[PDB]
Nucleic acid binder design. Structure first.
Ligand SMILES: [Mg+2]
Ligand SMILES: [Mg+2]
Ligand SMILES: [Mg+2]
Ligand SMILES: [Mg+2]
Ligand SMILES: [Mg+2]
Ligand SMILES: [Mg+2]
Ligand SMILES: [Mg+2]
Ligand SMILES: [Mg+2]
Ligand SMILES: [Mg+2]
Ligand SMILES: [Mg+2]
Ligand SMILES: [Mg+2]
Ligand SMILES: [Mg+2]
Ligand SMILES: [Mg+2]
Ligand SMILES: [Mg+2]
Ligand SMILES: [Mg+2]
Ligand SMILES: [Mg+2]
Ligand SMILES: [Mg+2]
Ligand SMILES: [Mg+2]
Ligand SMILES: [Mg+2]
Ligand SMILES: [Mg+2]
Ligand SMILES: [Mg+2]
Ligand SMILES: [Mg+2]
Ligand SMILES: [Mg+2]
Ligand SMILES: [Mg+2]
Ligand SMILES: [Mg+2]
Ligand SMILES: [Mg+2]
Ligand SMILES: [Mg+2]
Ligand SMILES: [Mg+2]
Ligand SMILES: [Mg+2]
Ligand SMILES: [Mg+2]
Ligand SMILES: [Mg+2]
Ligand SMILES: [Mg+2]
Ligand SMILES: [Mg+2]
Ligand SMILES: [Mg+2]
Ligand SMILES: [Mg+2]
Ligand SMILES: [Mg+2]
Ligand SMILES: [Mg+2]
Ligand SMILES: [Mg+2]
Ligand SMILES: [Mg+2]
Ligand SMILES: [Mg+2]
Ligand SMILES: [Mg+2]
Ligand SMILES: [Mg+2]
Lengths: 67, 144, 60, 260, 185
RNA sequence: GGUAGGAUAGUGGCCUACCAUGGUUUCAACGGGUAACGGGGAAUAAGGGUUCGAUUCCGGAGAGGGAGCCUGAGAAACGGCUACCACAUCCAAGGAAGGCAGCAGGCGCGCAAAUUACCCAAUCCUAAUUCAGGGAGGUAGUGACAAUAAAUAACGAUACAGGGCCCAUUCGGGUCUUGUAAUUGGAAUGAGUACAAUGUAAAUACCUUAACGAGGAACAAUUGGAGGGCAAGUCUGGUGCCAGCAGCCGCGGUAAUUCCAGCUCCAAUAGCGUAUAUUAAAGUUGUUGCAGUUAAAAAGCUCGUAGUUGAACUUUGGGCCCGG
RNA sequence: UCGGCACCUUACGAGAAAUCAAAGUCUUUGGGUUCUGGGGGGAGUAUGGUCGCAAGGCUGAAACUUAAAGGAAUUGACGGA
């Protein structure tokens, strides 16, 4: 079997230069509990509709369509 | 001196004469005038789908004595009416009145084949279920 | 060129042809072993070499 | 269309970068800089595809953002920085200094140099002009502007640039007898000094160059870089001394140097 | 957008589909060498067509031409190395005289039979295909392998894959397990 | 085309003013057609050629159609705006919003073309930026577009072909078994199934590998043919100028080598057939390289302009040296 | 002797042959140049243009159809030769 090997000078430099997926493979980084890519893109495009923080938008909606 | 000009500066006369005389061939004439896209019911295509209008019985040319079992077909893409031979024993029982046939050419690029007068096309599929497969045992024709 | 011949007989001979099922037989080998079988029947142990050779002799 | 292109297709990259055909649709487009797009070598091609020090482009970025590399004295943390001919790349770790010179097949070879030779570079004078307030300058082949040159410095000469201050130490004229390194065309990477120079008013002055095995070749004047006098070049020379052996001599050498 | 992937057809069919002489000759070839197909003859004919066309355009070049010497010597060296052209006979007008049987003799399926080890070409084919014979210590299961005259001494049975040792084998193990089931323990 | 001006980033009839009468064209202008984006290239060809190039790279143009513009270094931008035209969506009828020739997907059109998947790990790009973003791109799915390699068996004993020995005399002798016993024996292996590992961003698949995994090894190879061209049948049954076949020549009207079948045989083979287009074959476009008395074809005859073509002639010879 | 209308013999040669001193000097294929033809029909038709008083001329297709049409010679058969 033929492959490629890296031995870093220390484990701090291993964590610093080693890619995140290899550190997840070796146990030196946790896999992130991120969302799917289409959900992330849809959330971003939803946030593109809002200008400002939107607290005034939420309070104006809850004022106009409650009575 | 063999009729054509030979000189080093006669390439204009040679090429213009070749361009003029090239028109006398069948294929160059047909390709350059766009005959397949103006004439030729299969308007440049290899196959064409059409709707069966009628089952015809064509009497074969002499010295052959047979009825040839063709169909009259209106092409869907074009509206032109063509006559198409239904090739095998039986297989005119498989067509129907008024359903869908895929048609192809008939071997000789125009130019009706054999003893069959005026028929330049054959039926390849009917109802999209392939007359060879219908004829052997392979697939069953859909009822609707 | 008459286009209204009778279509009553379409399929006549194939519809009245007697049905014979294909005879069940041993399989023939495929590929390299079939070309091996062809080579033994044609160039190694051929005996029907009347004139040059024959391949499908009928009853004489 | 509509503005400057920012991408470079692979198979539209220069052939001397020796990029593999597969493993990407895109080649690293060289940034604007001292050298041209096609006459140069990006730092990612030098650090990943020549020295093999990095496996990715992300490792080239991780090397460069630690300020280890420097081109011509300054640090250059740009990944696609156009390092071209005569440029000196200093990698501080392993104390390596490189001068980008052509090997005689026409490609940028890895040529390790010393710290003395890394102190300077050579620049072919592209123009000599007066700037404003009457100050004269020369413009070299790598976009450097050097004020107050020697008045003997003309076009197609070669100045030596001190690279700690961008100053002209000495210079070499263009006249019959002195070495020529060839930096373009199909004689790219060759050496051999002279036969003469023919003028051709209107365009494309030609130089006849005859190497140490007495093979003449003509090159355009714009592809001609003076590196010194005949013997003792002002730079070190790469593996081969710019000879361009033919393919039979190449095979007669390669069969020899594999059976010990 | 990507680099296109180059591919080439490796054979040519004859222009005449039914010639009794050619069909007899190719069935004779496939019986002598144990071939699956006419395609395996057509590939060798394609390779000879390319070799002969290359040697022909070199032979019309004047002798002591640089391209003639370089490419002709490279062609001769490749054919000598693969064993089709002998270790004498290093001329371009003798590689025009090459035929199909020379390449068919150099196959791994022919070499495995020729160097003992197989007892037939049809046994050689199914020794090779069945992950037996190793050419270095490399298992090859390709019968069209073109043994290169310095691998001939190293063609043997594999370190794995019995007839080479280190384990009995699938139906031997099952049958011995059945005889252990029946007879003893 | 000249002069001057205006405009432009700048040259310029680019526009304007005033002049002059030019500019192009049988060496094909101008006009018409193109089922024309151009090129690198592709198929095929002894050589010369013929045909194709929407399509991975390069250049151009476009973003339903036209036009106009803002911003900006750069756009006459369309995942920017404005108007008109066409089409079309929501609506409380007041109004408001639109542009898949991006990716996926749908409808329609048709002979004719795939998932509303996963990811920025690679290649690169952009940003204030090592970090974010990227349907660019990559990964898989669908995929007989095309291409590469090559399973579907192999080997022995019981039976028989004879190539035989010393004149096997009449078959024994330590002969020598390829075809036949829908016999007989054990071996071999991957298709598949999967422990794991490796793979990979994560997977899948490959490669490796534990245990499984063939006797009708049903773990059953097909597609076209069997008159000629053109390899393979005057075999049997059916039909009886019908039905049908047949590229072409032809077969069928009661013994069909050709139809429909069965048996057997042939060819290519995980492929094979059909239709169309094109190349070779085609020296049937002929420059190489056709033909013109009679097969198609010397203008009725002569003049004549462009075109094509056009007699001979001008420093030859001798000697010497270096010299690859 | 030059020039002309031709003829006769031979086949060096040419041709599919009849025949041909040109229909030769052609696969051993290039002296110069013009025009014409590309299987048979449809068809010298339709249409457009142009000339003519007109009759017509000159230029001139296609759809569609077809497996031969033709040339020369041989043998036969036939002829109100
Ligand atoms: Mg001339
Ligand atoms: Mg015989
Ligand atoms: Mg663009
Ligand atoms: Mg860039
Ligand atoms: Mg194994
Ligand atoms: Mg002015
Ligand atoms: Mg002006
Ligand atoms: Mg003016
Ligand atoms: Mg002009
Ligand atoms: Mg177009
Ligand atoms: Mg193109
Ligand atoms: Mg194109
Ligand atoms: Mg188009
Ligand atoms: Mg645009
Ligand atoms: Mg649209
Ligand atoms: Mg901006
Ligand atoms: Mg726009
Ligand atoms: Mg859009
Ligand atoms: Mg855009
Ligand atoms: Mg789409
Ligand atoms: Mg894409
Ligand atoms: Mg399709
Ligand atoms: Mg879909
Ligand atoms: Mg990425
Ligand atoms: Mg996409
Ligand atoms: Mg199978
Ligand atoms: Mg394995
Ligand atoms: Mg049959
Ligand atoms: Mg035959
Ligand atoms: Mg037949
Ligand atoms: Mg030819
Ligand atoms: Mg002809
Ligand atoms: Mg005639
Ligand atoms: Mg005539
Ligand atoms: Mg005349
Ligand atoms: Mg004249
Ligand atoms: Mg002259
Ligand atoms: Mg002759
Ligand atoms: Mg013709
Ligand atoms: Mg004709
Ligand atoms: Mg008329
Ligand atoms: Mg006659």
């Amino acid at each position: 079997s033929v492959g490629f090997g890296l031995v870093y000078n220390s484990v701090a430099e291993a964590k610093k230069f080693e890619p995140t997926y290899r550190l997840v493979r070796y146990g030196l980084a946790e896999k992130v509990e991120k969302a799917s890519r289409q959900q992330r893109k849809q959330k971003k495009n939803r946030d593109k509709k809002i200008f400002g923080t939107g607290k005034r938008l939420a309070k104006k909606v809850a004022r106009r369509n409650a009575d | 001196g063999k009729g054509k000009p030979r000189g080093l500066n006669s390439a204009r006369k040679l090429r213009v004469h070749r361009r003029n005389n090239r028109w006398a061939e069948n294929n160059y004439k047909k390709r350059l005038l766009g005959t397949a896209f103006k004439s030729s019911p299969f308007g440049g295509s290899s196959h064409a789908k059409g709707i069966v209008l009628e089952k015809l019985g064509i009497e074969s040319k002499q010295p052959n004595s047979a009825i040839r079992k063709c169909v009259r077909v209106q092409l869907i893409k074009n509206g032109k009416k063509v006559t198409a031979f239904v090739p095998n024993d039986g297989c005119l029982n498989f067509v129907d009145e008024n359903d869908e046939v895929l048609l192809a050419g008939f071997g000789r690029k125009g130019k009706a084949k054999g003893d069959i007068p005026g028929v330049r096309f054959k039926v390849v599929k009917v109802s999209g279920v392939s007359l060879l497969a219908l004829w052997k045992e392979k697939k069953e024709k859909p009822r609707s | 060129a008459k286009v209204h011949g009778s279509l009553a007989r379409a399929g006549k001979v194939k519809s009245q042809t007697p049905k014979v099922e294909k005879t069940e037989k041993p399989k023939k080998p495929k590929g390299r072993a079939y070309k091996r079988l062809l080579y033994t029947r044609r160039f190694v142990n051929v005996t029907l070499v009347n004139g040059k050779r024959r391949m499908n002799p009928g009853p004489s | 269309a509509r503005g400057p292109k920012k991408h470079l297709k692979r198979l539209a990259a220069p052939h001397h970068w020796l990029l593999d055909k597969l493993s990407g649709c895109y080649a690293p487009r060289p940034s604007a800089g001292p050298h041209k797009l096609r006459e140069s070598l990006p730092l990612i091609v030098f650090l990943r595809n020549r020295l093999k020090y990095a496996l990715n482009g992300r490792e080239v970025k991780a090397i460069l953002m630690q300020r280890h590399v420097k081109v011509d004295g300054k640090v250059r943390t740009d990944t696609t920085y156009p390092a071209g001919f005569m440029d000196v790349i200093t990698l501080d770790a392993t104390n390596e200094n490189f001068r980008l010179v052509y090997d005689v097949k026409g490609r940028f070879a890895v040529h390790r140099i010393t710290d003395e030779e890394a102190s300077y570079k050579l620049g072919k004078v592209k123009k000599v002009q007066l700037g404003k307030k009457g100050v004269p300058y020369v413009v070299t082949h790598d976009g450097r502007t050097i004020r107050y040159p020697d008045p003997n410095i003309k076009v197609n000469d070669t100045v030596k640039i001190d690279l700690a201050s961008g100053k002209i130490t000495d210079f070499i004229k263009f006249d019959a007898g002195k070495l020529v390194y060839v930096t373009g065309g199909r004689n790219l990477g060759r050496i051999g000094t002279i036969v003469h120079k023919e003028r051709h008013d209107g365009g494309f002055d030609l130089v006849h160059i005859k190497d140490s095995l007495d093979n003449t070749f003509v090159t355009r004047l714009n592809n001609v870089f003076v590196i010194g006098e005949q013997g003792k070049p002002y730079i070190s020379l790469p593996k081969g001394k710019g000879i361009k052996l033919s393919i039979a001599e190449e095979r007669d050498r390669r069969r020899a140097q594999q059976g010990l | 957008p990507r680099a296109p992937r180059t591919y080439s057809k490796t054979y040519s069919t004859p222009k005449r589909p039914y010639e009794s002489s050619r069909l007899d000759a190719e069935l004779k070839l496939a019986g002598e060498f144990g071939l699956k197909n006419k395609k395996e003859i057509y590939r060798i004919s394609f390779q000879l067509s390319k070799i002969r066309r290359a040697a022909r355009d070199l032979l019309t070049r004047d002798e002591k031409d640089p391209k003639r010497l370089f490419e002709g010597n490279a062609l001769i060296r490749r054919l000598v190395r693969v064993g089709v052209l002998s270790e004498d006979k290093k001329k371009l007008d003798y590689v025009l005289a090459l035929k199909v049987e020379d390449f068919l003799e150099r196959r791994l399926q022919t070499q495995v039979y020729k160097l003992g080890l197989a007892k037939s070409v049809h046994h050689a084919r199914v020794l090779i295909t069945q992950r037996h014979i190793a050419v270095g210590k490399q298992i090859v299961n390709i019968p069209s392998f073109m043994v290169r005259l310095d691998s001939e001494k190293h063609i043997d049975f594999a370190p794995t894959s019995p007839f080479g040792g280190a384990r009995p084998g699938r139906v031997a193990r099952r049958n011995a397990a059945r005889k252990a089931e029946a007879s003893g323990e």
